[PDB]
């Protein structure tokens, strides 16, 4: 049998406040509580007493009706609260009309389970569990505070800010911690937050349990520097004590919920182990008349609080000499000048308690304005879900379909202001999905905590991210090759031929085809050689034209000389036009000239040699030259066969991925046949010259003819392997044909130049 704080009236309202600390882990079976609490127990009890005394003096709220109270101790424990709530319903087996409290989610669940069987409404002021919002299971429960889904959302928003992506997680065994951490994990999963590890611990566990918890937390220490705590106050205090014991300080950053926020109880004697933490607090202003009433209380004049003298002695650490509740464990007596205004800190949830009391009173008042000696619980419930009044802070209190009220959040930062002076600073707020938090007061300089990450970024280059499998946020980086582009963040793709990845490594741009022949020195030298040969051919043609009378040239056919000069000019033109452009007409002309010039020259030489071969039979000596023309036409037919073989073309050839060129079509076996034909013609003329090599001549043309034939044969025999030699094969034939034409020119009409001079 514990004591109870009762005040008489017409309607009795119950209340459950935790005046005492919960029983120690080794005394939970006896159900004996610990020391006295000031901000929770005594402050809340006096708040309820004075709130009812103030309500039943207002002539507008419930006139001609006196309100009564029955305040009991819940001790922050479920068994104690349940056994005290059984006392509320003993008469049902002046009845209690409603219950205000408690302030913990699991205790509230047990109390609600007991109470809803007797139709008793219950309005809580500090229980913010999500699962308490199910009206199918918890039908008579209401609260003037929002659920902690928005608080988990605020925590997720804060960790999204500052770019923390390898946080660790801790919560407290119960119903607040489990639901809050489940919501936090679910909200964080659809992002890149990648919780390192998750733990849980009881609030009244021993020192060894907290030591083991800290030893496990320090495993991820180098990277997971931030711990998201959804714990109560005593869990945080135990964490700080364990940090002090293990010589650890300043190696962690702790995020806290409303269990910790703005409470000096937890960060006392261990301020240095908790500097830098960030906490989320429910927004609520101070109450003035509560301070006015509270700071004047004295132990010898307060005759309605059974727990007041004990609290006075506990707070002032003295013993009241003659008082009935005098204890002798303190060695100094209580002075007469001890006042309650010294080091006064008001509880940060007085407004919610007073609002719950006013909600109950307004519900009763609205129910009365409608035969009422047995108060009906169900009726009262349907009169409490429609409450809409003005709170003590000027705001409007009203309930929704789920029986809870809206609210905002402040964000506090524990730091060191002066020297050996610590305090909580307001550094922002969270409201209705919007976070307004300033960064000048948290990490004033560029001393932002090294972010909780486990892998440095890899981008702006041919580098990949490969996930080992354990966590999607921990990865190793591997390079890509020189001809690959970043397709996805995790893969490189190699493009097709002729395409090279850009500097941005986003795609291949199909690099342009390279060709520069005019600027190259070897084609310039070839052009100079061709122009010199053309000038010489023009000069000799002009000389022959001027001397068309031919006093001694008449031995050689003038038409034969003209044909030879035309062939030399055609060869020079072919050499000039071999470089040209990759256009189809240019390659067609190149092929035509290559197949035309040497064959015509060799046919003319063969006819010239054969004209002197018959004489040591002849059909037509003068007309045989015409037959020579037909022979040339034969080679043209061979050229026609090439057009039957394959049409002219110009396509891109790729020696390598780095460089791709453009070259006109040229059949490897096609060019051989004209070469074989002119080689056979050269063999025939060499044989004919060797047959009559030693015969005399009027101008000694026999000696020059054999030398010319031998030189041309040697030149062709040397040039043939060159064609199948170097890879480019673009200027070897030009030089070969130019040299052959020059040799023919010279070793053909040098004696004519000697004679004419």
């Amino acid at each position, epitope marked *: 049998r*514990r004591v109870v704080a009762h005040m008489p009236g017409d309607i009795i309202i119950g209340a459950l406040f935790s005046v005492h600390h919960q029983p120690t882990v080794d005394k939970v079976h006896e159900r004996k509580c610990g020391a006295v609490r000031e901000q929770y127990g005594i402050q809340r009890v006096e708040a309820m007493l004075h709130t009812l005394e103030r309500i039943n003096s207002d002539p507008t709220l419930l006139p001609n009706i006196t309100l009564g109270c029955e305040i009991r101790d819940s001790c922050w424990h479920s068994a104690v609260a349940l056994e005290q709530s059984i006392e509320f319903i003993r008469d049902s087996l002046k009845p209690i009309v409603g219950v205000i409290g408690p302030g913990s989610s699991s205790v509230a669940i047990q109390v609600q389970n007991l109470l809803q069987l007797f139709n008793i409404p219950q309005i809580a002021y500090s229980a913010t569990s999500m699962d308490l919002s199910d009206k199918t299971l918890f039908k008579y429960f209401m609260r003037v505070v929002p659920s902690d889904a928005q608080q988990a959302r605020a925590m997720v928003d804060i960790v999204k800010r500052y770019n923390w992506t390898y946080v660790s997680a801790v919560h407290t065994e119960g119903n607040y911690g489990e639901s809050g951490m489940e919501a936090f994990k679910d909200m964080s999963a659809k992002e890149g937050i990648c919780i390192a590890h998750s733990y849980k611990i009881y609030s009244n566990a021993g020192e060894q349990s907290f030591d083991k918890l800290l030893k496990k937390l320090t495993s991820h220490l180098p990277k997971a520097r931030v711990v998201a705590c959804f714990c109560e106050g005593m869990t945080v205090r135990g964490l700080l004590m364990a940090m002090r014991r293990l010589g650890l300080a300043g190696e962690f950053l702790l995020l806290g919920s409303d269990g910790w926020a703005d409470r000096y109880d937890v960060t006392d004697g261990y301020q240095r182990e908790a500097v830098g933490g960030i906490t989320i607090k429910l927004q609520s202003p101070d109450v003035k008349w509560f301070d006015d009433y509270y700071l004047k209380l004295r132990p010898e004049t307060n005759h309605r609080n*059974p727990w007041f003298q004990e609290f006075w002695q506990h707070r002032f650490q003295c013993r009241l*000499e*003659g008082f*009935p509740q005098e*204890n002798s464990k303190y060695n100094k007596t209580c002075n007469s000048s001890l006042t309650l205004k010294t080091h006064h800190v008001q509880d940060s949830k007085m407004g919610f308690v007073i609002n719950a009391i006013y909600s109950m009173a307004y519900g009763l008042h609205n129910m009365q304005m409608s035969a009422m000696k047995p108060i009906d619980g169900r009726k009262l419930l349907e009169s409490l879900m429609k409450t809409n009044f003005t709170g003590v802070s000027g705001d409007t209190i009203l309930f929704d379909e789920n029986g809870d009220s809206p609210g905002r959040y402040e964000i506090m930062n524990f730091k060191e202001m002066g020297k050996d002076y610590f305090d909580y600073i307001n550094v922002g707020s969270w409201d209705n999905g919007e976070l307004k938090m300033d960064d000048d007061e948290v990490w004033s300089k560029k001393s932002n905590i090294i972010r909780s990450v486990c892998s440095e970024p890899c981008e702006k280059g041919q580098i990949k991210v490969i996930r080992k499998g354990e966590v999607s946020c921990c990865w190793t980086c591997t390079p890509c090759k020189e001809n690959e582009y970043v397709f996805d963040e995790y893969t490189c793709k190699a493009c097709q031929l002729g395409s090279w990845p850009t500097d941005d490594l986003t795609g291949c741009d199909l690099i342009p085809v390279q060709y520069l022949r005019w600027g190259d020195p070897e084609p310039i030298a070839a052009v100079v050689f061709a122009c010199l040969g053309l000038l010489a051919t023009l000069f000799v043609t002009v000389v022959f034209i001027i001397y068309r009378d031919t006093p001694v040239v008449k031995s050689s056919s003038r038409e034969l000389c003209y044909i030879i000069l035309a062939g030399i000019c055609l060869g020079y033109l072919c050499t000039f036009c071999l470089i040209a452009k990759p256009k189809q007409i240019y390659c067609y002309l190149q092929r035509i000239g290559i197949g035309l010039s040497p064959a015509m020259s060799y046919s003319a030489l063969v006819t010239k040699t054969n004209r002197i071969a018959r004489i040591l039979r002849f059909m037509s000596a003068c007309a045989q030259l015409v037959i020579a023309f037909i022979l040339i036409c034969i080679q043209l037919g061979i050229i026609v066969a090439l057009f039957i073989m394959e049409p002219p073309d110009i396509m891109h050839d790729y020696p390598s991925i780095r460089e791709v060129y453009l070259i006109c079509n040229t059949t490897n076996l096609g060019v051989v046949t004209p070469l074989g034909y002119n080689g056979l013609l050269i063999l025939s003329c060499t044989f004919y010259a060797f047959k009559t090599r030693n015969v005399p001549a009027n101008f000694n043309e026999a000696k020059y003819i054999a030398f010319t034939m031998y030189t041309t044969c040697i030149i062709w025999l040397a040039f043939v392997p060159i064609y199948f030699g170097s890879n480019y094969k673009i200027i070897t034939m030009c030089f070969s044909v130019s040299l052959s034409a020059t040799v023919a020119l010279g070793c053909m009409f040098v004696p004519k130049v000697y004679i004419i001079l």
Partner: nanobody, 123 residues
Framework: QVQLVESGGGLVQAGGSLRLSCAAS????????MGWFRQAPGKERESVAAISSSGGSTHYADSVKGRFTISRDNSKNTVYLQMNSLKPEDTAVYYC????????????????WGQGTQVTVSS
């Protein structure tokens, strides 16, 4: 409702000793301080001794200092008063009271009282 019953009174000679026992029915006896009163026939009512709720703090009236001795037993919910060196002026009716929310003794207000018992001391 805590109820108090007294026993041990009677007739005795001077120079002897006696014991009075006050028993409380109902729990929460450990949260009420206890006090003993005496009243002579004709005179007013005075205080004799008092003990705190948890024991270990006893106050005695100056007229009976050194003679009486007050103690309590919370296990059996009984408060005892031992009288020694009785004198004829101690003949009176004795009462047992429970106090809570008081001040320095004897400035207590008592929620309950007892029937009392008669103690006569003869020469």
């Amino acid at each position: 409702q805590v109820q108090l019953v007294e026993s041990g009174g009677g007739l005795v000679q001077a120079g002897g000793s006696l014991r009075l026992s006050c028993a409380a029915s109902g729990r929460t006896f450990t949260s009420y301080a206890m006090g003993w009163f005496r009243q002579a026939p004709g005179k007013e009512r005075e205080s004799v001794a008092a003990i705190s709720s948890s024991g270990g703090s006893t106050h005695y009236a100056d007229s009976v200092k050194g003679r009486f001795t007050i103690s309590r037993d919370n296990s059996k919910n009984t408060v005892y008063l031992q009288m020694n060196s009785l004198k004829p002026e101690d003949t009176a009716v004795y009462y047992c009271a429970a106090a809570m929310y008081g001040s320095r003794w004897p400035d207590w207000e008592y929620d309950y009282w007892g029937q009392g018992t008669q103690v006569t001391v003869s020469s």
